[PDB]
Write a protein that binds this ligand. Sequence first.
Ligand code: WBS
Ligand code: WBS
Ligand code: SAM
Ligand code: SAM
Ligand code: CL
Ligand code: CL
Ligand code: CL
Ligand code: CL
Lengths: 381, 381
Amino acid sequence: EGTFLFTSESVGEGHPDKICDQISDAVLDAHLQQDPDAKVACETVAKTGMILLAGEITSRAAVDYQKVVREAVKHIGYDDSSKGFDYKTCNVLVALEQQSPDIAQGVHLDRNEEDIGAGDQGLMFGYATDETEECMPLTIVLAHKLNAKLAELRRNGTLPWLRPDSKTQVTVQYMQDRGAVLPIRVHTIVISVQHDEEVCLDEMRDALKEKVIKAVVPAKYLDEDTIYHLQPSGRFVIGGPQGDAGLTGRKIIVDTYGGWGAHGGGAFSGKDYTKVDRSAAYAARWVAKSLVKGGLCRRVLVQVSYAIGVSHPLSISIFHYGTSQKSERELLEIVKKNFDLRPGVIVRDLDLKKPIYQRTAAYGHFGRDSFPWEVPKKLKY
Amino acid sequence: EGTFLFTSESVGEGHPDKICDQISDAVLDAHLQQDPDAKVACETVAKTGMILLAGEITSRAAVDYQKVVREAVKHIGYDDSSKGFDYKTCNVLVALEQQSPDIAQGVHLDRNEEDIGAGDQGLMFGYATDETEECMPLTIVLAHKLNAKLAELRRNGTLPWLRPDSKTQVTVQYMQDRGAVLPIRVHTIVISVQHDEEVCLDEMRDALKEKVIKAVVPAKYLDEDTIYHLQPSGRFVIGGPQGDAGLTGRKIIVDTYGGWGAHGGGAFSGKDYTKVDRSAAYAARWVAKSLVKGGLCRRVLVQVSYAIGVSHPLSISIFHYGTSQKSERELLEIVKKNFDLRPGVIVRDLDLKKPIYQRTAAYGHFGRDSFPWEVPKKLKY
Ligand SMILES: O=c1c(-c2ccc(O)cc2)c(Nc2cc[nH]n2)[nH]c2c(-c3ccccc3)c(-c3ccccc3)nn12
Ligand SMILES: O=c1c(-c2ccc(O)cc2)c(Nc2cc[nH]n2)[nH]c2c(-c3ccccc3)c(-c3ccccc3)nn12
Ligand SMILES: C[S@@+](CC[C@H](N)C(=O)[O-])C[C@H]1O[C@@H](n2cnc3c(N)ncnc32)[C@H](O)[C@@H]1O
Ligand SMILES: C[S@@+](CC[C@H](N)C(=O)[O-])C[C@H]1O[C@@H](n2cnc3c(N)ncnc32)[C@H](O)[C@@H]1O
Ligand SMILES: [Cl-]
Ligand SMILES: [Cl-]
Ligand SMILES: [Cl-]
Ligand SMILES: [Cl-]
């Protein structure tokens, strides 16, 4: 009574959708290194032997797409045909055009930077929860860390049968606590990871429990009833793009809160700051985290929305789940007094011309590494 | 006090992401017409002059991809270079392989149909709300209907300057009502739609208000304070894939609840029933709607999750927002007694081998047309 199960998932750096996100952001970063005002909307598609870039870029930079793509794939670890994909020998195809002049004229041409219009319509949410220090749901934090642990043990050679494509999933039993949530125990863990042709299933399952799960999940959350689904498909030799096509922006829930809070549908990777799908979601996270770390609430969800060409949000809304003594109306006044959610101001507050985006594109965009949107603003009220 | 704004969006049939969803489901349907057991994972990518199919299909069908793709684009309305895209003359590229044998062996080979494994891990949600008869949020219903109205007036020739690519966005002021939500008024509407080179902005804005909004949104929701952003970019002649690359599965929030409820991240289009991203989300909608139409709650969210190769969900969870006299524990017992959420049973209950998927791929998968997942189950308890 008062408890429920909740599940979130994450994926590894070599998951084919995440490959695409990382490549899209490597392209963005390459442009921004040379032209901080590049307009970038770079989608990546991955299938056996192929990376395709499709989208719209207007930029003063001279970018070697072959090098940028191949270096990103090398970093992920796909470096041999035996692994199913090789940065040295794959096809890299480019279908990139300039940004539509109709978009450019309606969004940013002949506009003062602070008054640039949103690059599109849409809705975006930010969320924070006091259940972890980093203000993220435990389900998603643990799922990300399990993938990171796999990559670590692959790269350090202790589990050399590992390959880069992985997925994880964590189910936690939660208790209610005055509108907030408290994690009690881990009910179920799934891990699936691509592997070489030589290792056997029992060796993999033993390693995944002892060297991955136990190295990540605190023992206080694990008990004799916890259910483990380790390599549940039985065989995962074919992987990466060869096993499953990847596309940019197909892991938007992994990128955010693991299903908690809410999501407006927009993808992050491959987009410069004028695309509010990214910048306003980052700003909304920053607002939410600022409210929780400032002691105003324990758990909070912020919605913003925009119209293409219009700088100020059309709507700003807040829900605190009953975890503040202040009304949501009062919290909204505090937010309005402390934040300016025009994209041309967000860019300054969060330093969004800086080429740090490839680092955001695996293991979630939130709750990690003290990115600007993770540093709470001191609120005046 | 007790009120908040909430925004949802929708897109039209010629929006480039939605083009991709529709093509992916046209391909699925073509396979299912000949082989009800086809294994389909068809991604579509669209950019100027190009439809690319990428993914994995194992099927006994003989499908003419050129015809299927081009007929889908014709139906949407892209039939001339003057509109930016033409089904008769575009490039159709195919990068389709068989389903991975490692997946096939772990999911469905040599398994009894009812006991087939989930085609992947993941989490899925179903939602229902009593605020409309179709048990959907008003924000998303209105946003979809505005796009449908644009397509209607394009196809009937009364606004012949319209083209197929459109987006809409609706902000509603809601009041709290004992855990449920009540819509009060429409605060803001956005409409952006591709148009010919001859029509002027004032003609478009007048038509969008008088012939689109007033034909869709009840006057009781509109007042002298409602804000209208009609063609806010000022010019939208370039559109469709030429204006913005499209990909399958990039409108997952438009496809579902417009940001309400929750989303697990999986895309629907291009996937047969063994992909629980689709089948289990449909079943979860069916459960949620059955609970509301059965009088057990006014508003409800259901989560399910799976592991690849495992037939039964790993977790089932329910949240009723305080809108039931029964506890969520009791509702879960009712759900367990009345539903079987194995994919190999869902397929029978919801008739998921039937080639009806292209019809789901615009205007949302839920709340429309009495699809099987929209017909409530009579609950025994
Ligand atoms: O706040 C809550 C509470 C809650 C928290 C503290 C309190 O004092 C009172 C109630 C809650 N309580 C219970 C109890 C039995 N079942 N549920 N369940 C949930 C869910 C959720 C759960 C199961 C499936 C689906 C969504 C969510 C959510 C999660 C993700 C996205 C959107 C909503 N929030 N939430
Ligand atoms: O249930 C509620 C209630 C509520 C309903 C009936 C009651 O008797 C008591 C409370 C509520 N109340 C208020 C009041 C002032 N602000 N909020 N606000 C919300 C939101 C939401 C709102 C603004 C931004 C973001 C999310 C949501 C939601 C919507 C989509 C996804 C997830 C959660 N639910 N919700
Ligand atoms: C299961 S595949 C999706 C379904 C697939 N498109 C098909 O044709 O059936 C989704 C993800 O699961 C992982 N995956 C691929 N092959 C797998 C296998 N043999 N066992 C487990 N997971 C696998 C990869 O991370 C892949 O991107
Ligand atoms: C604004 S575009 C996204 C940003 C774009 N990729 C870029 O290069 O800036 C997203 C969607 O908005 C719509 N759109 C395209 N051109 C537009 C215009 N000139 N005015 C308004 N909306 C437009 C189309 O539905 C398109 O798919
Ligand atoms: Cl996936
Ligand atoms: Cl191998
Ligand atoms: Cl879009
Ligand atoms: Cl024209």
